Amino acid sequence: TDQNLQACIDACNHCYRTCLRMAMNHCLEAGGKHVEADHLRLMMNCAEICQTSLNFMLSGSRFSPKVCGVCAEICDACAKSCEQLDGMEECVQTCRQCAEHCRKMAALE
Amino acid sequence: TDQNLQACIDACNHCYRTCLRMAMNHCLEAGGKHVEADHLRLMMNCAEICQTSLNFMLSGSRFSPKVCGVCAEICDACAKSCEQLDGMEECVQTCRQCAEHCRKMAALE
Amino acid sequence: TDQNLQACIDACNHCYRTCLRMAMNHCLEAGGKHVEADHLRLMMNCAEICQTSLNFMLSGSRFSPKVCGVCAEICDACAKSCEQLDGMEECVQTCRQCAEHCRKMAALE
Amino acid sequence: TDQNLQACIDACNHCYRTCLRMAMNHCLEAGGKHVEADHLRLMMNCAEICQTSLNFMLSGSRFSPKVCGVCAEICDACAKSCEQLDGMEECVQTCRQCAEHCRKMAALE
């Protein structure tokens, strides 16, 4: 548990940083499909939910599993959205990893 | 939808403000059971999740229903925790209302 | 103080909701200049700082004045950015009001 | 700049995680002076401001210097508050480091 918890914390933290950074930088400066309504919203949503999951686990919440389950779903969708664009390889990777760790946390409940 | 969406937004916003305010003020200044580990964490968790739900709906996320479902669960638990303490009547009320609106949003998915 | 504090809280809360909503909806769906790098970042930054100011005041922080001073600066810049675009009248208005209340809070320190 | 920016980002991220974790865990489970109104508020305020600074820099905001200046002030105060309690050595350390990097960012403006 000590290991899994810390592994999901770092994953959510990494994915949150990556989604926010790329959306507010790479995507905004590339325009076109990178700034399409559904994609950008998802990008920000993903950063938001990951940050929430991170905070719940940092605070020792007993509701982390539930929050993580939702986070995994949003991460998977964000990863698929990023598959369409280029230079977004780093985002696809982090969103898949985070989703996997979050699913493991959700399976605890 | 226009009405329900706005109703749940105001409910989450109100409950988020109330939970944060009371936890960081009333509860901290009362000590005793008001600052018990499980209660305070829940209080902050509830404020966090409500703020997340609020942000998802404000941003027009298609994942609001899912997030709201989790928010309703945390709100119900926070409401029960506040039933134990005194001067917490306002928190019980707002947590119940928010949970109800969030359940309505979750039922959309 | 009781009045001023509550007035700045509602102003920050209103401006935060407005900036997030319009950026993630109106601006993203309008494209063009509405999604220009500097403008959108500012929009999100403004929503972020207002949310932080709101949280500091809700929590009874003694550092609210300082945070509010920074919030006023960002709100003024966001208001000017929105003056360029159309349909953004509501954002200009809320950013100016919030900036004024925040300046009043900052003047307390 | 590339180095300094990344150094302050990791510092704020580390300090934010540490303040939230310790406040919601160690301090809440220790009670006594660890849960004193002013100390806990500061702890949460510090986590909040650091998270805001982190987000501003991640998003490439031109207002990071200003936000960081405020963050450094709150970090210094939180570090002094933690000097009073025991087992809080890790928090004192991270709050001092973050404050130093934030001061460097603020000096850019």
Please tell me the distance from the alpha carbon of residue B81 to that of residue B92, in angstroms, as a whole number: 8
B7 touching A (Cβ < 8 Å)? no
Structure tokens at B39: 């209660």
* CA-based nearest residue to D39, from D62, D68, D19: D19
Number of domains in chain C: 1
User: CB–CB of B70 and A67 under 8 A?
Assistant: yes
Residue in the block written with tokens 């990178």: A34
The amino acid sitting at A95 is: C
Please tell me the distance from the alpha carbon of residue B34 to that of residue A65, in angstroms, as a whole number: 25
Q: What method was applied to determine this entry? A: X-ray
The answer to whether B93 and B14 have CB atoms below 8 angstroms apart is no
Name the DSSP class of A25.
Answer: I
User: CB–CB of A20 and D55 under 8 A?
Assistant: yes
The answer to whether B45 and A63 have CB atoms below 8 angstroms apart is yes
* CA-based nearest residue to A73, from A44, A106, A40, A28: A106
Please tell me the distance from the alpha carbon of residue C96 to that of residue B82, in angstroms, as a whole number: 38
Q: Is C43 exposed, middle or buried (0-12, 13-18, 19+ CB in 10 A)?
A: buried
The answer to whether A81 and A39 have CB atoms below 8 angstroms apart is yes
Q: Compute the half-sphere exposure of residue C29: CA atoms within 13 Å on the CB side of its CA.
A: 9
Residue in B49, B66, B69 nearest the CB of A52: B49
CB-based contacts of D104, cutoff 8 Å, min separation 6:
D4, D8
Please tell me the distance from the alpha carbon of residue A33 to that of residue A14, in angstroms, as a whole number: 24
Please tell me the distance from the alpha carbon of residue B40 to that of residue D20, in angstroms, as a whole number: 13
Count of C-beta atoms within a 10 Å radius of residue A83: 12
User: CB–CB of C55 and D48 under 8 A?
Assistant: yes
Please tell me the distance from the alpha carbon of residue A72 to that of residue A82, in angstroms, as a whole number: 15
CATH number of domain containing C41: 1.20.1270.360
DSSP symbols for B3-58: HHHHHHHHHHHHHHHHHHHHIIIIIHHH-GGGG-HHHHHHHHHHHHHHHHHHHHHH
Please tell me the distance from the alpha carbon of residue D49 to that of residue C46, in angstroms, as a whole number: 14
Please tell me the distance from the alpha carbon of residue B19 to that of residue A37, in angstroms, as a whole number: 32
- Phi, psi torsion values for B41, nearest 5 degrees: -55, -50
Please tell me the distance from the alpha carbon of residue D87 to that of residue A74, in angstroms, as a whole number: 37
- CA Rg value for chain B: 13
The amino acid sitting at B70 is: V
Please tell me the distance from the alpha carbon of residue C10 to that of residue C102, in angstroms, as a whole number: 11
Please tell me the distance from the alpha carbon of residue D74 to that of residue D95, in angstroms, as a whole number: 9
Please tell me the distance from the alpha carbon of residue D71 to that of residue C42, in angstroms, as a whole number: 19
CB-based contacts of A32, cutoff 8 Å, min separation 6:
none
Centroid of chain to Cα B98: 6
Please tell me the distance from the alpha carbon of residue A61 to that of residue A63, in angstroms, as a whole number: 5
Please tell me the distance from the alpha carbon of residue B56 to that of residue B60, in angstroms, as a whole number: 6
* CA-based nearest residue to D63, from C43, C31, A31, A50: C43
Residue in A41, A42, A70 nearest the CB of B67: A70
C31 touching B (Cβ < 8 Å)? no
Cα separations in angstroms, C16 against A34, B18, C48: 25, 17, 7
Most B CBs within 10 Å, among D16, D19, D40, to test the B interface? D40
Centroid of chain to Cα C92: 10
Count of C-beta atoms within a 10 Å radius of residue D77: 18
* CA-based nearest residue to A20, from A31, A32, A12, A9: A12
Domain encompassing residue B74: 1-109
Helices and strands in chain D, H and E counts? 5, 0
